[PDB]
Amino acid sequence: LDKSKVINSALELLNEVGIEGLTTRKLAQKLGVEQPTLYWHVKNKRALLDALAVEILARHKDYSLPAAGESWQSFLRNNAMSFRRALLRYRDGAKVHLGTRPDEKQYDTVETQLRFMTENGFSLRDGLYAILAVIHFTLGAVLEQQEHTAALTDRPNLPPLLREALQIMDSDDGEQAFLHGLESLIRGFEVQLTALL
Amino acid sequence: LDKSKVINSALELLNEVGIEGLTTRKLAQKLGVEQPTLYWHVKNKRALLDALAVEILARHKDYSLPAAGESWQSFLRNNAMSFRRALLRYRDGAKVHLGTRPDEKQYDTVETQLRFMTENGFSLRDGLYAILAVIHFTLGAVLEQQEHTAALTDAPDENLPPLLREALQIMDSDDGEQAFLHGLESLIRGFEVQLTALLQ
Ligand SMILES: Cc1c2c(c(O)c3c(O)cccc13)C(=O)[C@]1(O)C(=O)C(C(N)=O)=C(O)C[C@@H]1C2
Ligand SMILES: Cc1c2c(c(O)c3c(O)cccc13)C(=O)[C@]1(O)C(=O)C(C(N)=O)=C(O)C[C@@H]1C2
Ligand SMILES: [Mg+2]
Ligand SMILES: [Mg+2]
């Protein structure tokens, strides 16, 4: 009857109806309380969504900080893949994350990641841009995957390249395509960092 | 009614009520026709969104094919920039695009795009993965842009640590375009290194 139990109902509802159907009204029903009483703990849908994003990563993003000795390349790769896996746990998990900014509970992690970059030859700006590029790529890759599978519920002799392309994409959940683009980002950051020197 | 009529009012309604608010019931109302009349044009919201996605690129994605003698680098950069502009045109445009596949009317262009990549020494697979990476990154950047601004009215926390404070300062300084162009160019430089790694 608090803030934490809103969150655990709201995760269940999200999986059931998705982000669109996750309303203040519907969550109150599922909890069996009035709408203003959810407010004491989860103000509105934005605050609720913000809380859900944080909880999803807290539970299911099991890599955030570099290990002793770890390259920034490896740090970026593991962070991106872990974030992807976490977004994929819940339905519309990536939609939930869109437009959120770091929460008070994540500040020390995020700061350590930013510091790490600056310690590995990046300017704060460039270290940040690299991280945001990895985050944006992961968000779009997952949101495309998540939405395409959803859309097959409703949607019903090809050119040789496109036919081959489609077979390649349908081979898995997008993972190999993801890992390729992720490495390309990393390889590009490396070139840029070497360039500057 | 006919196709352009349905499409023009759908796009207008998208700007009015956004993707969540958009319903075939409200489009029929707006068009002044009964439900089954529209049904035979758009069977549901998923069909409507598909039709909108295609139309938005048809009208506002001004670049798709490379000029004679244009580099693959430039081709990728130009497709992304143009894709982003088309997505920025209408409310929730990046959300409308999500999940779709190329339409039969886009097949000829896509095949030409894939072949061009193979003509520059990409395997079909790696050319595909390059194009998808640029698309995905562009969607995510745009969606993050369209969504953070959206939630603006829903004071900077005094407990913000310094790199994070400054980082958030850096991000707000513009509409996301600087970060987007840096990310796009990182992708392109990485494709280059990879293509060179193999083609050596
Ligand atoms: C480093 C940084 C990240 C994120 C940001 O939003 C940032 C931002 O808005 C400004 C400056 C830096 C940011 C994330 O959203 C992120 O997904 C995140 O929060 C967590 C995490 N909580 O573990 C990550 O591990 C990766 C990402 C790091
Ligand atoms: C090659 C390919 C593209 C796209 C896809 O969605 C694909 C997909 O979902 C599966 C397999 C291949 C895809 C696009 O969305 C894209 O933005 C597009 O359609 C157009 C375009 N219409 O001009 C492009 O110019 C580039 C992109 C090509
Ligand atoms: Mg984020
Ligand atoms: Mg697409």
Swiss-Prot record, chain B:
Q: A single GO molecular function, which one?
A: DNA-binding transcription factor activity
Q: Which terms under GO biological process does the entry name?
A: negative regulation of DNA-templated transcription; response to antibiotic
Binding-site residues for tetracycline, renumbered to this chain: 61, 79
Entry keyword set: Antibiotic resistance, DNA-binding, Magnesium, Metal-binding, Plasmid, Repressor, Transcription, Transcription regulation
The superkingdom of the source organism is Bacteria
Residues bound to Mg(2+): 97
> What is its induction behaviour?
By the [Mg-tetracycline]+ complex.
Q: How does it assemble?
A: Homodimer.
Function, in words? TetR is the repressor of the tetracycline resistance element; its N-terminal region forms a helix-turn-helix structure and binds DNA. Binding of tetracycline to TetR reduces the repressor affinity for the tetracycline resistance gene (tetA) promoter operator sites.
What is the name of the protein in this document? Tetracycline repressor protein class D
Q: What is the lineage of its organism?
A: Bacteria, Pseudomonadati, Pseudomonadota, Gammaproteobacteria, Enterobacterales
Covered range within the whole protein?
Answer: 51 to 206 of 218
